[PDB]
């Protein structure tokens, strides 16, 4: 049968923060304190799951090609035979006619008569300098809007333009770029 | 010092000889106005016949 570290202490109560500590006594080389995390964030208990090693991103009637403005609800990969999905118009538009796509026995679709008419025009995303008058979320057909470059130098071109539901076509790269 | 100040603050005023006798043994009877650091040595021996 022929300094050394002593026994560790009991784990202190889990504090409000993650910080939970345990202390060892040299009664030598080593550590006297060990601070670990604890929150018990997992409240649900169903069963021990089994995990794989690594996965990948990507591996009846198929997903149809929607009309203009798309916006197909409850998008799925495969639709059952006979199931009909309603399509809605993207803002800002409105559903006119018969808006339903029913799965044919074959891979084709019925493609009922439907269209989208613009009910309100949206605020332009041209540049942050506006502060465009008037400043709202949506504008009905017949309302005019005015954009300026504050506070000194301004941009030439159409200052006041209204939306008549005619698919506004302002420049997107060099829209205003008001120079001195 | 803070301890002596606290002791003087928590001190009676009706001639409490009991606590005063304890304070006396605790902080001495009288302090030194001037000292002399160093050290002394002496040896004596006596003979009689």
């Amino acid at each position: 049968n022929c300094g050394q570290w002593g026994c560790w202490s009991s784990w202190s109560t889990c504090d409000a923060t993650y910080k939970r500590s345990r202390t060892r006594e040299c009664n030598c080389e080593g550590e006297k304190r060990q601070e670990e995390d604890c929150t018990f964030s997992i409240m649900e208990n169903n069963g021990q799951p089994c995990i794989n090693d690594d996965e990948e991103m990507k591996e009846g009637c198929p997903q149809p090609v929607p009309p203009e403005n798309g916006f197909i609800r409850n998008e799925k990969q495969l639709y059952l035979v006979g199931e009909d999905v309603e399509i809605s118009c993207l803002t800002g538009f409105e559903t006119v006619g018969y808006q339903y796509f029913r799965c044919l026995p074959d891979g084709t679709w019925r493609q009922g008569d439907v269209e989208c008419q613009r009910t309100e025009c949206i605020k332009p995303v041209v540049q942050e300098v506006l502060t465009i008058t008037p400043f709202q979320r949506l504008y009905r057909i017949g309302e005019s809007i005015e954009l300026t470059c504050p506070k000194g130098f301004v941009v030439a071109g159409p200052s006041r333009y209204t939306c008549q539901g005619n698919s506004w076509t302002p420049p997107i790269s060099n829209s205003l770029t008001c120079e001195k | 010092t803070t301890t002596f100040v606290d002791d003087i603050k928590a001190l009676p005023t009706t001639y409490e000889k009991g606590e005063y006798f304890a304070f006396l043994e605790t902080y001495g009877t009288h302090y030194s106005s001037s000292g002399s650091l160093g050290g002394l040595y002496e040896l004596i021996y006596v003979l009689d016949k």
């Binding site: 997992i42 799951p49 409850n74 993207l90 | -």
Partner: protein, 279 residues
């Protein structure tokens, strides 16, 4: 135990929490963590979320929330639509800016239903424009998911919002064919589970779109997985997962098919009546 006693105890704990969150209110109506030395927008929006959750049950003073939102709109709102905080790789700055902006959008949208204001609506419009303009590049899964959720709390049928949702669905991770589990990973080709936040944000975004088939695999993922867990802050993700489970249960309760259809003529008698049930 009786449900009434537990409900009363929970109400008492909610009152204690309301007193606690009132103790964290500074004189400037802002919200701070340590004694109010510095002002933080993250904790402010977190407390705004908490107060918006409280709004639905007992009561909350509207005047204390309207001015609190006006403070942020006046100070922490950039002219571009971004949001920042005072209390403290070039693209990481923009990533953090978009994160704070989405967090503030979530907070203001949660606190907007009780205090409708024109200035708050203008701030929401500006922040939505910022998020729709600056989320074009693929920066991070977590930032993409939090921006998608912040935009789904508002307008859900925006073109750029649908593009962001499609990009997030393309960036989704699946397991099996058909996918049994669906989740999102922040790091590409990588207390260690950090993807739970973005998975919860994408779950909330999908629940805002009312798609049960797309939500079910994420529910299977968050029910049992390698989290163990396994989340941050906490409870930045814990409350998000609780809200996701709550919205899932609510939407399941929404699909009961108890509709009683009675079709009739305008100027004449009724033609027929339908009694719709689950069977």
């Amino acid at each position: 135990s009786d449900p009434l006693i537990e409900k009363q105890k929970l109400k008492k704990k909610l009152k204690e929490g309301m007193l606690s969150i009132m103790s964290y209110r500074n004189a400037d109506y802002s919200y701070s963590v340590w004694k109010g030395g510095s002002a933080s927008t993250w904790l402010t929006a977190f407390a705004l979320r908490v107060l918006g959750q409280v709004n639905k049950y007992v009561e909350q003073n509207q005047n204390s929330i309207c001015n609190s939102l006006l403070w942020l709109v006046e100070n922490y709102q950039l002219d571009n639509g971004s949001f920042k905080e005072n209390s403290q790789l070039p693209v990481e700055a923009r990533e953090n800016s978009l994160y704070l902006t989405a967090f503030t959008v979530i907070g203001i949208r949660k606190a907007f239903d009780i205090c409708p204001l024109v200035k708050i609506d203008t701030a929401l419009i500006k922040a939505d424009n910022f998020l729709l303009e600056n989320t074009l590049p693929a920066q991070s899964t977590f930032t993409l998911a939090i921006s998608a959720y912040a935009l789904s709390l508002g307008d859900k049928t925006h073109p750029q919002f649908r593009s962001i949702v499609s990009a997030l669905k393309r960036e989704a991770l699946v397991k099996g064919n058909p996918p049994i589990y669906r989740f999102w990973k922040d790091n590409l080709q990588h207390g260690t589970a950090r993807m739970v936040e973005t998975t919860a944000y994408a779950l909330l975004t999908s629940l805002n779109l009312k798609d049960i088939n797309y939500v079910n695999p994420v529910i299977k993922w968050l029910s049992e997985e390698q989290r163990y867990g396994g989340g941050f802050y906490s409870t930045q993700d814990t409350i998000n997962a609780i809200e996701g489970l709550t919205e899932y249960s609510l939407l399941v309760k929404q699909l009961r098919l108890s509709m009683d259809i009675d079709v009739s003529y305008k100027h004449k008698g009724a033609l027929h009546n339908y009694k719709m049930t689950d069977k």
